[PDB]
Amino acid sequence: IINIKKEKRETDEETKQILRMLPKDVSVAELLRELSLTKEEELLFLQLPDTLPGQPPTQDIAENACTLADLTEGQVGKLLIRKSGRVQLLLGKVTLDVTMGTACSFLQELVSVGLGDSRTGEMTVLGHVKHKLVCSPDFESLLDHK
């Protein structure tokens, strides 16, 4: 029997129903093992808030939503890992917090669909997505500040 086309168990984390013979991680230890334990690159999928703490630069406006489509390239923020497991994102004067999202176990392929021509385009499989991050405003600090 073919080994890469066996039947799959309902539990996606325990699909190994037949053999030839997971604790919930944290973002700080995740990045630590991604950089210290290994050096291989990894593709992440983080969810940013609706409005970023910035203004659309010369985008013809109004206090509207400021997403990544308005910001330019270059360094836009820093990622801080404090003690006791704190993982913050300093995006300027404010600091958000980054937590682990829903642990997806199904296949997630990050691909690039580039329509170079109006009749023929190219689909480029960039990689696979395994972990999901969630960035949230530190509302407690924003409230105690003013």
Partner 1 sequence: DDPVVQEIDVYLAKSLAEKLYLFQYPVRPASMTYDDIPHLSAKIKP
Partner 2 sequence: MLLFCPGCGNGLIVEEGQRCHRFACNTCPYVHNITRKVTNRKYPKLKEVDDVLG
Q: Where does this chain bind partner 1 (CB under 8 A)?
A: 4-5, 8, 12, 15, 28, 31-32, 35, 45, 68-69, 71-84, 86, 88-89, 91, 104-115, 121, 123, 128-130
List 95's β-bridge partners, or say none. Answer: 90
Q: Identify which of residues 31 and 134 has a Cβ nearer to partner 1 in the complex.
A: 31
Strands 95-100, 131-137: pairing kind: antiparallel
Stretch that binds partner 2, among 10-18, 26-34, 37-45, 124-132 (CB under 8 A): 10-18
Residue 13 interacts with partner 2 (CB under 8 A): yes or no: no
Least spacing, CB of residue 49 vs partner 1, in Å: 14
Q: Identify which of residues 83 and 145 has a Cβ nearer to partner 1 in the complex.
A: 83
Q: Which residues contact 32 (CB under 8 A, 6 or more apart)?
A: 81
Tell me 70's DSSP state. T
Binding test (CB under 8 A) with partner 2, winner from 12, 14, 16, 17: 17
What does the buried/exposed string (b/e) look like for 28-65 if buried means 16 or more CB atoms within 10 Å of the residue's CB? bebbeeeeeeeeeeeeeeeeeeeebeeebeeeeeeeee
